[PDB]
Design a protein around this ligand. Structure first.
Ligand code: CA
Ligand code: CA
Ligand code: CA
Ligand code: CA
Ligand code: CA
Lengths: 198, 200
């Protein structure tokens, strides 16, 4: 298996010392996908936000450690369901090539438990996107059922043919909070993109 | 309490009957509506406008190395606009409603037609999305997850579990079968839509 490198693919940057502590700024190496302007430029704990969080022993949110390393990346949206979507985006240096099969995998987390006496029960729905340029080549729109406190792996594959219109455009990844339910937060971890001849 | 099929109108595009092999309609199949969020499909269609309809895929067909997945006919969507211009396809709202503690399984066969039509190559594929709705909300969707070679069909499967806390319970279920217009030749076929519900 041959990987395409991704920056901060496991959200391990930055290091977080205290269990369940978190940042509220875009993880290094990623940008905030914000097509509906739901996430402000300047965040608090309680605005719509995204960032990184440490899942270790003593976590109140999960029934297992982080899928990879210490940290997961989270997206929280405070607007009512139906208001739009937001998430993580990363554009890669690798470009779409013909007769090549791409396999994107990411672990999707449904945080459970309670935060400042607010229940995290429920899930907003997720979408995992593989891009060339601004085009979604293939995407998993919420196909996995993920219970509170658990993670499941989403897998998206795509084969580009010689006649594909998007050849030579940069590959990208989006990890999206759909805001289709409450509690309206979800987590991602361990992003992997691998490539093989068709 | 067990696996039940939810009824869908004209679910194999068998209405209308078509006598000549590879003959087709260019109007919205009975029981479905034209999903047209980017206004790509005109209200009146001819062969080479953007359109949708049904087509007979039987012995003699120039478009597939297999017969129609179900019965005689498939349903198709063709888009004349350039890649990137938008999407269009089929939509059907069902009488059934979203119920809690249930698992839904939507299956449809997706066809990448091959061959030639009026010296126009059918090689290539626009991409598809299959959507399960409640009300206006796409609960789960297969956005082009299967690779489908020219001249074959593959079955797309979408599942969704509805919890007691789902915001859209009691809203009408719906189905969308979408041409993504992300490639040429910019037509694709669908057949054999099935929706089941079972305790979760
Ligand atoms: Ca990690
Ligand atoms: Ca949750
Ligand atoms: Ca896992
Ligand atoms: Ca049929
Ligand atoms: Ca084709």
């Amino acid at each position: 298996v041959v990987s395409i490198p991704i920056n901060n693919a496991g959200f391990e940057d930055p290091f977080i010392e205290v269990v369940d502590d978190y940042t509220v700024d875009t993880p290094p190496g990623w940008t905030t996908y914000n097509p509906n302007n739901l996430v402000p430029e300047k965040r608090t704990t309680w605005t719509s936000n995204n960032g990184v969080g440490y899942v270790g022993p003593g976590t109140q949110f999960y029934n297992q450690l982080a899928p990879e390393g210490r940290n997961i990346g989270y997206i929280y949206l405070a607007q009512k369901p139906g208001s739009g979507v937001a998430g993580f985006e990363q554009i890669l240096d690798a470009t779409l090539e013909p007769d090549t099969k791409y396999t994107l995998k990411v672990d999707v987390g449904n945080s459970g438990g309670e935060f400042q006496k607010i229940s995290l029960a429920g899930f907003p729905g997720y979408r995992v996107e593989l891009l060339a340029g601004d085009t979604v080549l293939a995407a998993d729109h919420n196909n996995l059922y993920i219970k509170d406190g658990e993670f499941k792996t989403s897998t998206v594959t795509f084969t580009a043919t010689p006649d594909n219109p998007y050849l030579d455009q940069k590959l990208g990844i989006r990890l999206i909070n759909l805001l289709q339910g409450t509690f309206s937060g979800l987590d991602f971890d361990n992003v992997r993109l691998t490539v093989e001849p068709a």
